């Protein structure tokens, strides 16, 4: 392509990095260093305490939650030698999952999703992972992680993660993220089952809004999952020097999982389209019954009103000079034709 | 040699010859007045207000050594922004934009730029532009424009256009914010018409902005010899701003679509409820019209004469059927 440089933005000083987000509540740096023999964990809020970990033999996992603090991000990037555009991408959350391979580090942007039962939003938060010689730098917007299994594996010496380097740590984080995606798909399964139960019982406008927001959420999920598939493909099919020769089959497993997620998302979309069609048919039927009632009454009272007007005539010479029970005869005739046409419409299975 | 546009009100020539030493400006109506400035070493700016005056634009076309095809493109108005490179000069087409919030209207005017050796020509449609900041900068030395060459003037012109796009985006932003409340709360027909108009304006803006991004990209990636390398980064800056505009209009587009969807899919409920209203009105009043017509159905007999004070009694039984309709619909929850 072209040379990479910090793009200028109107209304800002030339070198400003801006956090492109909405979360500004909390911020802390948790450091988890681990080897086979021992491990040390500590939380803090000063970057000068975590900087000494740039040069360390044992693998380490730095996790900075809260990126509204641009100062700590800039300091970490300039100490770790990270390119300023990668820092700009870390603080920009209006992106899609991506992977960039550099000489001394690899930069990965992924997304964490959260589904709320109430009001049925689909909140998203990017996670940025910079993989270095022996350090994994994680940047998050707010608290709430899906990497607690990885933390437990490090803490209690399960698996083989303590015996491997930072590449396996990056694997553990991505695998936990994909498992979170599976859990999100399960939540969407529950939501679509409940909404399908409700759709044919109460065809209301809130059902319309729920279905449309579900479709939009599925579209956004696909827009996220496809670049995730591309990143996982590039990780094991275009291997940088940072990732060792082994651990590639692990990335292959994650790529297979992403394939599964994409297929599930496409099936989800076709199911919800069918559900919307079913709702439209149900509402059309609900209008149809009211239409049947209207046409029943109209066909009852058009000709009878005509003949009432014809016999409400004020002309000089009408049969209003009547033979015995003439008006009862006329009303009996009108009633019998009314019941005959009622019988016909019953033969039509409307009344 | 045809003017495709619809503006023919006025026409005048604005000339600005400026150097590091002195500057001088003309507001005339003679084509020959701009002739001596084709070979002037110092940077020169020509502004031709009226394209419909085909004679003057053609005359400057032959005198400045431009091919007739770009002249026809200049005369044409309703064409997307584009760039074209020659070994003598460079030709650019860009779009003005004005937005009336009171009428929710969007208007575009085409401007054509021709950067030749140490001089710039510009062609507009109406009077009024967004290059007044550039004129002030040239006049009172508010920048570095008088210390630089003619290719910096093209930068200034395009930058001013991009700033006008930013102002138009601010206006569209406030209109979108109003219309979102107009849709989510109390939807109404005029709000739907406003949404359609905004969709048209946004699609036109996108179809205009993307070619402008391509034009500035082609300008700064493979720079022609007309534009100096020193001024290449400045163009890059302007190019970046275009991306900015791109994203926001895209976002705006999405929002509008969503709004429309929320109104569009909830249309079967409207017909359902209005059919309910008409059906209940008929259900209640057609039988009562029958009762009135048949009890008023003229005869000599009229067996209901006197008949225990007559009409109020039938009113009662009439009222009877009336209520037995409404409660039934209360059973049906219609109304």
């Amino acid at each position, epitope marked *: 392509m072209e040379e990479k440089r910090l793009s200028a*933005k*109107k*209304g*800002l*000083p*030339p*070198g*400003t990095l*801006v*956090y*492109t*987000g*909405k979360y*500004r*509540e909390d911020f802390e740096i948790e450091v988890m260093n681990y080897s086979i023999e021992e491990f040390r964990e500590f939380k803090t809020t*000063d970057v*000068e305490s975590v900087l000494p970990f740039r040069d360390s033999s044992t693998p380490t996992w730095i996790n900075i939650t809260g990126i*509204h603090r*641009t*100062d700590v991000v*800039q300091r970490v990037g300039e100490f770790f030698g990270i390119h300023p555009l990668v820092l700009e991408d870390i603080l920009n959350v*209006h992106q899609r999952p991506k992977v960039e391979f550099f000489e001394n580090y690899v930069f990965i942007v992924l997304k964490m999703f959260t589904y709320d039962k109430n009001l049925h939003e689909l909140e998203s938060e990017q996670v940025s992972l910079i993989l270095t010689k022996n350090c994994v730098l994680m940047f998050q917007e707010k608290i709430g992680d899906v990497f607690d299994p990885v933390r437990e594996r490090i803490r209690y010496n399960r698996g083989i993660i303590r015996k491997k380097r930072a590449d396996y740590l990056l694997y553990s984080l991505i695998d936990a993220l994909v498992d979170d995606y599976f859990v999100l798909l399960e939540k969407i399964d529950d939501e679509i089952d409940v909404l399908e139960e409700e759709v044919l019982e109460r065809p209301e406008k809130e059902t319309v809004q729920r279905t449309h927001q579900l479709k939009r959420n599925l579209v956004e999920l696909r827009k996220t999952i496809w670049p995730l598939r591309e990143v996982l493909s590039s990780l094991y099919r275009d291997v940088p020097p940072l990732i060792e020769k082994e651990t590639v089959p692990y990335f292959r497993d994650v790529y297979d999982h992403t394939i599964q997620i994409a297929d599930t998302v496409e099936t989800f979309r076709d199911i919800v389209s069918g559900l919307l069609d079913v709702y439209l048919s149900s509402v059309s039927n609900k209008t149809n019954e009211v239409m049947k009632v209207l046409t029943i009454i109209a066909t009852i009272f058009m000709p009878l009103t005509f003949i009432a007007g014809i016999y409400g005539m004020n002309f000089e010479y009408m049969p209003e000079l009547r033979w015995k029970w003439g008006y009862p005869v006329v009303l009996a005739v009108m009633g019998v034709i009314a019941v005959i046409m009622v019988v016909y419409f019953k033969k039509k299975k409307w009344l | 040699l045809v003017y495709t546009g619809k503006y023919r009100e006025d026409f005048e020539i604005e000339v600005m010859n400026y150097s590091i030493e002195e500057f001088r400006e003309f507001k005339t109506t003679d084509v020959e007045s701009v002739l001596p400035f084709r070979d002037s070493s110092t940077p020169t700016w020509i502004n031709i207000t009226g394209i419909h005056r085909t004679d003057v634009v053609q005359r400057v076309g032959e005198f400045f050594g431009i091919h007739p095809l770009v002249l026809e493109d200049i005369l044409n108005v309703h064409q997307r922004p584009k760039v074209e490179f020659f070994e003598n000069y460079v030709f650019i087409v860009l779009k003005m934009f004005t937005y009336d919030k009171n009428l929710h209207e969007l208007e575009s005017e085409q401007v054509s730029l021709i950067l030749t050796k140490n001089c710039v020509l510009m062609f507009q449609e109406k009077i009024g532009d967004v290059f007044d900041p550039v004129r002030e900068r040239i006049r009172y030395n508010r920048g570095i424009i008088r210390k630089k060459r003619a290719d910096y003037l093209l930068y200034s012109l395009i930058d001013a256009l991009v700033d006008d796009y*930013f102002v138009l*985006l*601010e*206006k569209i*932003d*406030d209109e979108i*914010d*109003v219309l979102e*409340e107009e849709v989510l709360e109390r939807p109404e027909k005029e709000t739907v018409q406003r949404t359609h108009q905004l969709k048209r304006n946004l699609v036109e803006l996108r179809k205009t902005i993307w070619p402008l991004r391509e034009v500035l990209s082609s300008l700064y990636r493979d720079v022609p010899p007309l534009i100096e390398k020193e001024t290449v980064p400045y163009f890059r800056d302007v190019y970046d701003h275009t991306i*900015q*505009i*791109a*994203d*926001t209009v895209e*976002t705006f587009r999405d929002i509008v679509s969503g709004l429309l969807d929320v109104y569009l899919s909830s249309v079967s409920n409207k017909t359902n409820e209005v059919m309910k209203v008409l059906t209940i009105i008929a259900t209640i009043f057609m039988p009562l019209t029958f009762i009135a017509g048949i009890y008023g159905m003229n005869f000599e007999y009229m067996p209901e004469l006197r008949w225990k004070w007559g009409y109020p009694v039938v009113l009662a039984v009439m009222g009877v059927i009336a209520v037995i309709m409404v409660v039934y619909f209360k059973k049906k929850k219609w109304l």
Partner: antibody
Amino acid sequence: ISEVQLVESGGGLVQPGGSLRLSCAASGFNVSYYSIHWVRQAPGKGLEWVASISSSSGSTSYADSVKGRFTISADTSKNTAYLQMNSLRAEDTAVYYCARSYWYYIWSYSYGNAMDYWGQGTLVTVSS
Amino acid sequence: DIQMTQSPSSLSASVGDRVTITCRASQSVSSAVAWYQQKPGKAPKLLIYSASSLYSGVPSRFSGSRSGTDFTLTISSLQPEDFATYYCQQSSSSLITFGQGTKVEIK
């Protein structure tokens, strides 16, 4: 370490037409990473922004009422922001505050800044 | 300069009442509006930014809304520590401006 705090000094009585420099020292952040603003509140009147600085780029901005005489500078070595006021008249008697702002995101083309922390405010009087 | 006109200027209410203050900009600003409060003799405290977003640490009672060029701050459940002077600010341009304040006093 510690907490964000801006302490400003240098304000005092000055004769009309004179000049003086007001300094603002930070503690809790590097001055270059964020933008530093000066806000002037006349005695018994509302706030009136005067100047801004981004030390990392020197993109100084001045209000129209004080442009041409006030200058704003920032040095990272001392972590200080200075406002030098020359040609000071009797309308410039007020209390001055040294605020720190952060940029936030609204739209792609739209950016806005909001001031997290404020100083104490130094009283600058210009009379007799 | 983009002028912000804030109304009213001498609002008064008791504890538990609802307070609304609206400032309008002479020129369109793309939701880059902040609301501050100032107690007598102290520095202003940031309350609202982005015209809707709530600053961290302030009580949840304060709220902000935008309608076109109008921006309204609302105090729902007023408390005896909300009696200060509230100011608008627009950061749409480099030349940022302020409103002339709105004192909320006792009744």
